[PDB]
């Protein structure tokens, strides 16, 4: 019709959404958990320091076994580590050094890497030739791969510098669904545990919840003042944390459609680089541009602890599926394991 | 204690370590460079000229005088560079191409902003990102011959009133363009290096070699406590 119609209906619907949210704001999380006993100090020690990356570690992913993790560095290697034994299981020479994302398939059979090359490189770990080789070069994006995450051995969700996400069929090497609706450079993915949903943060400071199967953006979360560098689902799939360059995390609930809590402190001017939840959801661990990770009580927003063993920007932070340990990777090339 | 299999795993780990160290040696003996430029700055013809002069992201390996140069053209990234330009925090230089013909061109596609003022805005933003405090900037002012044409047809005073020099002279105009770019650096310890080149000129790879040599001399001055 005309912008004097459609772009005013958009405003009316945005106002109706905000009104519906504020009607849903029965009581903030901080009021309901005011009676919850705090978690105290979560003191944690560096149990492992995985040394052998030579450039900035950019991304990591725990395997489902909660023991192996891949990690990507701009030396052009993926390293798979036995975190129990400090052993390097594989080091993969990558065609493009400019890695920025890393995924482990939940079976362990594959790893993915992506970068300024607009490819998510699916590497097969279990060949009979006993070398890792590139099984697929998923080459249909047109801006850098910011995040790749496997749904299954045949399916990976991907996030790019081009504002789109794409679901891929690895077998046929092609997009099965493209998720169009962010306006900013989209930065991080997390699949929900049921794998039926995922949530994505972009430089437009919005988070969008996508149906993998339908393709629809069910909901859009907007409370951040700047880019969502980092995103993670709360382990029930009903909430997710969003870390931003505004030096805040925010907890969004998928069914409140609303910001539940903000994790902020005046001393914290540095942006959040990674977020992950402890298995019970009770701790939210945030990496920073400051050379630290802060452990937040996700229910009460008290800083239960700080992981301070790094001498450069923490780039990635994953908690094992079993909750047993926190890995922290940083621009000092060291991947420190904590519990 | 470790079993026979855990020992052979450790041995694989240590063989991977020695491969990682040998690729560290290789990746450190190569000077990375980041080639940037505006649209129609001539990245293709410029690289092709280095390629004939030599004996979504394209790494061009060059190997000069036993030193290897990894000239990173980041290509057509449809992406917000603030989110990935820190990948190049470690590069020894930004190579910035500006075409000296761009002063007469206004952005025909969008508005009428000078093609040189967009190049100025990109130069300012790159030179002011905190990642590039240790990198120098190498500024190739390409297509001087097209400026040597345009000056006969489109006077530079009409597009930049700050030009005090003569309207006849190519030298005074390209000196003015270099001044108008060098003025943009607030980090006056950061040496901008600049060359005037043409697609005819094979010397550009020697200029790159020697500008990167000077950057490494400056860094070795800082690293070795020589002020």
């Amino acid at each position, epitope marked *: 019709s005309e912008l004097d119609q459609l772009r005013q209906e958009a405003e009316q619907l945005k106002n109706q959404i905000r009104d519906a949210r504020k009607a849903c704001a029965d009581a903030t999380l901080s009021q309901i958990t005011n009676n919850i006993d705090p978690v105290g100090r979560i003191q944690m020690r560096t149990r492992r320091t995985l040394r052998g990356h030579l450039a900035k570690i950019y991304a990591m992913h725990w395997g489902t076994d909660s*023991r192996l993790l891949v990690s990507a560095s701009q030396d052009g290697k993926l390293i798979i580590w036995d975190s129990y034994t400090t052993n390097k299981v594989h080091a993969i020479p990558l065609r493009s050094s400019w890695v920025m994302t890393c995924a482990y398939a939940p079976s362990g059979n594959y790893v993915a890497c992506g970068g300024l090359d607009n490819i998510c490189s699916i590497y097969n770990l279990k060949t*009979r030739e006993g070398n890792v080789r590139v099984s697929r070069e998923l080459a249909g994006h047109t801006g850098y791969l910011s995040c790749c995450r496997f749904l299954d051995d045949n399916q990976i969700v991907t996030s790019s510098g081009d504002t789109t996400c794409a679901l891929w069929d690895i077998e046929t090497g092609q997009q099965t669904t493209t998720f169009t609706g962010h306006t900013g450079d989209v930065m991080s993915l997390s699949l929900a545990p049921d794998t039926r949903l995922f949530v994505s943060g972009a430089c437009d400071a919005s988070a969008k919840l996508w149906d993998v199967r339908e393709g629809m953006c069910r909901q859009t979360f907007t409370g951040h003042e700047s880019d969502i560098n980092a995103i993670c689902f709360f382990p029930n799939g009903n909430a997710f944390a969003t870390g931003s360059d505004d030096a805040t995390c925010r907890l969004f609930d998928l069914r409140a459609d609303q910001e539940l809590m903000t994790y902020s402190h005046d001393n914290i001017i540095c942006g959040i680089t990674s977020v992950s939840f402890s298995k019970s959801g009770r701790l939210l661990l945030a990496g920073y541009d400051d050379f630290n990770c802060n452990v937040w009580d996700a229910l009460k927003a008290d800083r239960a602890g700080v992981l301070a063993g790094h001498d450069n920007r923490v780039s990635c932070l994953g908690v094992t599926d079993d909750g047993m340990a926190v890995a922290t990777g940083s621009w000092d090339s060291f991947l420190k394991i904590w519990n | 204690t470790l079993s*026979a*299999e855990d*020992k*052979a795993a450790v*041995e694989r780990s240590k*063989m991977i370590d020695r491969n990682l160290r040998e690729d560290g040696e290789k990746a450190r003996r190569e000077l990375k460079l980041l080639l940037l430029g505006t649209g129609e700055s001539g990245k293709s013809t410029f690289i092709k000229q280095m390629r004939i002069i030599h004996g979504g992201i394209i790494e061009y390996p060059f190997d000069l005088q036993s030193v290897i140069f990894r000239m990173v053209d980041v290509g057509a990234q449809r992406s917000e560079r603030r989110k990935w330009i820190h990948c190049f925090e470690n590069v020894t230089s930004i190579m910035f191409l500006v075409a000296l013909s761009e002063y007469d061109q206004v952005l025909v596609e969008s508005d009428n902003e000078n093609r040189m003022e967009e190049s100025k805005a990109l130069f300012r933003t790159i030179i002011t990102y905190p990642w590039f405090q240790n990198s120098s900037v190498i500024l190739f002012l390409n297509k001087k011959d097209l400026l040597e044409e345009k000056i006969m047809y489109s006077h530079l005073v009409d597009y930049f009133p700050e030009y005090d020099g003569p309207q006849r002279d190519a030298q005074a105009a390209r000196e003015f363009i270099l001044k108008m770019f060098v003025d943009l650096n607030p980090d006056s310890d950061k040496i901008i290096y600049s060359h005037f080149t043409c697609s005819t000129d094979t010397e550009n790879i020697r200029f790159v070699f020697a500008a990167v040599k000077d950057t490494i001399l400056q860094l070795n001055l800082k690293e070795y406590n020589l002020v």
Partner: single-chain antibody
Amino acid sequence: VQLVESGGGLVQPGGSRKLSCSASGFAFSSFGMHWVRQAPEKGLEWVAYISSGSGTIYYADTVKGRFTISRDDPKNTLFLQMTSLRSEDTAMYYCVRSIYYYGSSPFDFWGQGTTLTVSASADIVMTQATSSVPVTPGESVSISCRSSKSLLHSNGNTYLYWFLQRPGQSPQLLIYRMSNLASGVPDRFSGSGSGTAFTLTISRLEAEDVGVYYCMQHLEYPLTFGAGTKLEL
């Protein structure tokens, strides 16, 4: 993936011969290599191991010093230079590849073997007290193995392996670390054990399952095999 062993045949005792095998279709330098031998009517015996990069070479006491194991990784070829050959060295010799990382399957591929004819101890003892089982297709049969030491290492891995030598071909890995089926093994195989007693349960047996079944330990060198239970159709 191929291993082709060659340079067997007949030698006079006290002689010397270099039998060899060449690898194709895999990153041989990544793999560690074992030699396993089989006397003309006897069980498997581990001869030697050479790891990736020619480190941590090991031999059996029956071949230590007298045999030397080497690899030409650029040529992807393995050589066993035998010397002081003896009547007890008459065997089929197998190249066996091996790879060692969390969750790997070592001993997965075995070359076709090479015959050597000669004209004529805290080593873990492995017992397969049942040397034969009469089997009928569709039956369930539960091969059992015992070791003179518990294979449950303190890291929780039971370093036990099962091999099937289908009659007239090289052994094939069925199970690694007591309870993982190898690539391509039918899911009808299953492994179980207490760490010192073990049982292989071939459910829904097939005529492809008859042959000789070896249990092996990978806790300590020398690597040791049971005598092998033969399944007879």
